[PDB]
Design a protein around this ligand. Sequence first.
Ligand code: NA
Ligand code: NA
Length: 91
Amino acid sequence: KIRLYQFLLDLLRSGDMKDSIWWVDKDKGTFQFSSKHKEALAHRWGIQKGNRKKMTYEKMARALRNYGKTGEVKKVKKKLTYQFSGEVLGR
DNA sequence: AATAAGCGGAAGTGGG
DNA sequence: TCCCACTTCCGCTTA
Ligand code: NA
Ligand code: NA
């Protein structure tokens, strides 16, 4: 099954949830979630994964924080903003 | 207070 | 056995 960072990168490339997520600086790999429309994107992640419970942004962001140590995604000190690593972007 | 983003320890689930 | 890659739950902090 697809990994969360790849799910997000695929959405950003396809543009299918443009009102929920967007690039801030695609060259740097920085992206930002919609304050009002992030939950619809979280819901789609959980359904794609076939999880038992409804997915929420809180739980999705709990998973995102676990990438901080390995580096695929880092939190940026801006509201709802994160950054993919160069390695993730290159693939 | 009400709302919201952010945090992470701990334990549970999946598929190796 | 025991790690993967999250998921779920809970309590806390800051604005
Ligand atoms: Na967040
Ligand atoms: Na929030």
